[PDB]
Amino acid sequence: KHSVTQYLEEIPQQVQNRLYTSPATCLAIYRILPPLAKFFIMAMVFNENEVPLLDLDKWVNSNGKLQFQNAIKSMKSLHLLIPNKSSGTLMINLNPTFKISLRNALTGGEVQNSFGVVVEENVVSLDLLDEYSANKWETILHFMVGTPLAKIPSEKVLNLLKHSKLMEEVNSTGEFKITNEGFQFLLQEINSQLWTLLLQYLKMIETSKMDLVDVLHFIFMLGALEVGKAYKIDALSETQRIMLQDMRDYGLVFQKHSNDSIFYPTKLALMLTSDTKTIRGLKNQDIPDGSLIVETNFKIYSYSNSPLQIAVLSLFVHLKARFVNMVLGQITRESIRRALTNGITADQIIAYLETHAHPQMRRLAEEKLEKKLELDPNCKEPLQVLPPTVVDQIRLWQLELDRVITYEGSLYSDFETSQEYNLLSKYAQDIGVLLWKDDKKKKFFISKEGNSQVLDFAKR
């Protein structure tokens, strides 16, 4: 995933408060704010009385401020607030647009997306207009992600795949292969594939007729309220309607027929915003219709399969033959190595197996999890969860394909006295924020979280 919350924090403050003006947008971004901030956002949304940070420090319980630290840092990063140092404290006040935007949306307001949806004869039911969108999304999956047939009606989807890095193949020739961007995008269960590719559509068409805030407000508009009658045609600005019409043609929006109609309630936008059940020429079988293969015997036993689903699997397992229910493939060190040569590190497949292709791994893991939460203090013997042997197989193979291990962080200095280095190191062991420490050199390469909290005490 491109981590749009870390990309949306790079955009300047004027366009961030541009987004907060719509109560529908304020509610939509509210669902993605961290839960501790969610409590803080609703708290400061209701009473707009300026309070020093010390009182807010009294409200909460003991340790757990790591959510608080990241929340306020996120709040400043995307500038949903403005820190005002009045009395030497933090007189945290919510951004005027963001503070006012949630007032209507929480109290049944007229958010441009929320009230812009038109109630009418919703001929597009739950299965209406979503199967085409899933197929259009399925087509763009075969073209962008790389599948046997690229039947995606979104030509702009294919073009965004080449220049925008949506497809890891020959962009100039019109192909969509699997590459570093494609492996990272396809590694994401739902959000990573949706967020990464959507950024190219916004980033590419973002200056001329794009309407950065206008296209975003329309995208937040679709999730702000159900379009219903005159939704896709109506709830779409100059960039939104072109984006919605492009989405209607490209599968981004579940519009009606003729490229100009009411917004049919497709499940693609619901999948992006609510992040809920991804299950959708008129047969829509789910949820356990899709599935994958994993085994301790290093052999894949597939009984349920899907057209595009096996295409992803065969990119990291040898594909020999397709049967009525079985697809030939034997998972070994060699099997993962197929994508490992292409530079795709075997990191996102580990999360892939336990998140997707698991609908056929349900019973296999049903003997894995074993409800090891309440009995974890009682019994300390795992029943192979999460799979370590396949992890041992992949880590040994992935290490071979790299032979070098690289760590990320930031080097620090100014450890003049030995006491300060030791005191943070010991607490770092409690939180696991230090990769490695040494009093002799007084330098280590980690992130700013250890640095930030120590200065927070120093500053406050």
Added chain:
Amino acid sequence: PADFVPDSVSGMFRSHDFSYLRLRPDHASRPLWISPSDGRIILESFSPLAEQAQDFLVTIAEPISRPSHIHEYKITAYSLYAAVSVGLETDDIISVLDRLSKVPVAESIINFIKGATISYGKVKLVIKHNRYFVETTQADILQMLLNDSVIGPLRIDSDHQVQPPEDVLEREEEDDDIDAVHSFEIANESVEVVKKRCQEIDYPVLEEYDFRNDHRNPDLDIDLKPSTQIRPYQEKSLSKMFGNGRARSGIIVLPCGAGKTLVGITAACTIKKSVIVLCTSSVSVMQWRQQFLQWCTLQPENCAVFTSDNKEMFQTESGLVVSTYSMVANTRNRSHDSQKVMDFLTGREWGFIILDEVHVVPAAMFRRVVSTIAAHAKLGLTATLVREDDKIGDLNFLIGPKLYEANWMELSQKGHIANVQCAEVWCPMTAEFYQEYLRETARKRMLLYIMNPTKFQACQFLIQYHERRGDKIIVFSDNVYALQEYALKMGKPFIYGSTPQQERMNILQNFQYNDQINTIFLSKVGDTSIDLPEATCLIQISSHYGSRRQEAQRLGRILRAKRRNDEGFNAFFYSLVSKDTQEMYYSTKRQAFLVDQGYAFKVITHLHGMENIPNLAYASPRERRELLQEVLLK
């Protein structure tokens, strides 16, 4: 030929389609998934009779896949003979399997299942007045018995007689099926042709062995005592061969060195006739009889160990004998004494022959000796599923239908060798191994990566860990000089090349009886063959060890029974292999081999505190190169 391919049809009948493959009608309402195309029975967790399908499928087929949730099946052509003997119905096997397994019963799968349940391993052979007759147990066998060229054409019109059935039994069909049915007595010429006509029409027959009805063979001097040990895999090999009433002849592949002959000797006791034991080689005859057969109630002085170099009493024994194929008929005919046994084996009507690892000796001599010897029944106690003795005459149909298979997963998990933790040690590389890999690629390098000091130190972790755990550590190294150099550093008694035998068993005396000395370094002198020791941690250093069929035998041999269950992993295996060296291919063959054998597999590359273990000699990269040049002498 007297053998038919039908005893070894395994390895085929595993292929299906998707558009060609029909979707299983029982998939909508069926617990398992038994697809005839792949030959599998994928028994899910929702099966009302999941155990029954495995019992019905296990008796008739071989489950190739052993997943926790869903299983798989492998091709087994001989399973028709075993499936017929178990009792699975021809229609019954398909009807239950088709309904239970989701994959619909295909015509080829149903026809074979219908054939396997009844036609496979359900032949008819009649016998009257305690003899062999031209008939069968059922009406079809009666038509079959008369319809045989030797059974029917070589038969007398008399239904049965006391003298002919007792004496004559187109020769005495003691490999016939259940008697006491409609038939007519037969001539006494050509059981060779009789077993030739059975295999050509491919009719696996549920043979019997009526020793009590054979007046030509007197009751021999056999000391009938079953006081020998009985083991979970031994009784059913007896029970399935014995069945109900009379016994029979067949193939029962057994673990070598795990009392393989024990079923035969006990089976020899029941039949009370002329029985001979054939071993792999002459040196094994004395070594194996000395290693376990003393506790056995068989008679060492009567069971003349035929060697052809040391002379015993022959053509004079009133009871059983023990010998080898090499003694029987091979280039290993040290003198005319062996040929004198062969001549006597014709004049004497020998009814049972026990085979020990036939696969080493080519089968061409097996057919030559049988015709002249005029044997009644045999017993091939082989070990390997795949063999070079799959010639036109299959030893299965040459002897009889198989009863029990060498289910190694049963004996390596039930307490003897339970919790098989196979490992392959990838010792960290260095310059000289990479320097030696590039400069020369000949097999002379085979010992130039074996000499790894980290390998010895990787062994030394197993030396200290297992002695602390009270386990047993076994090292396998075909070389001598470098192997001797190994364990002097740790200063303990150790097996080595051309060791004095009394000392090595004295080393074994401290090995499995005492706990302070627990590391034994078996050389190529171990096989074949010596006393395969009790195995708790087996270390293999040589990884070429041609051929792969020897590897299956060696893997089964040294990894032997261990009557100890303190640790959760009471049977370790380690393959100390230098990485970025020549043994990449050879070790990776083992890695696939152990998992295909069914044993649980792991990789041990990170010992607990590798650089802090004692005896850090030659640890530095400079010192390792010096030994590599010393190993150039070997």
